[PDB]
Design a protein around this ligand. Sequence first.
Ligand SMILES: CCC(=O)N1CCOc2c(cc(-c3ccc(OC)c(OC)c3)cc2OC[C@@H]2CCCN(C)C2)C1
Length: 116
Amino acid sequence: KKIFKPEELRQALMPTLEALYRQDPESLPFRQPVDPQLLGIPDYFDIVKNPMDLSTIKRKLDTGQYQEPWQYVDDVWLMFNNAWLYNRKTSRVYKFCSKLAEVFEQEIDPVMQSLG
Ligand SMILES: CCC(=O)N1CCOc2c(cc(-c3ccc(OC)c(OC)c3)cc2OC[C@@H]2CCCN(C)C2)C1
């Protein structure tokens, strides 16, 4: 307690996710799960033990898998930290991740205040 209904969390938090999706080209590496099979990077899951991406976060909101808002924030940051862990600092993915984190920080704060 506080108790959050899945519908309130979705209503309040989805705009913050949409803000990330709206970033182009910066969201593009983040819209679906990393496929180490396709990209030929079999070490990806050795390095990244808990993968996360926007599609997965959107599904969790959509299907009521978050009980409290910090679980959502933690997944967003997991996505960021996975990308900064794995990718070189000159890479598109890395630079795009840094942009997404700037955008997210701005959106998430007033939302998290309201939700309490
Ligand atoms: C969070 C994503 C991630 O950490 N990856 C794990 C790392 O692999 C990649 C990955 C994605 C991209 C990438 C880039 C640009 C895109 O649109 C503009 C895009 O759209 C789908 C994807 C690039 C990746 O790597 C591209 C090459 C792969 C071969 C080595 N080289 C250094 C980078 C996946």
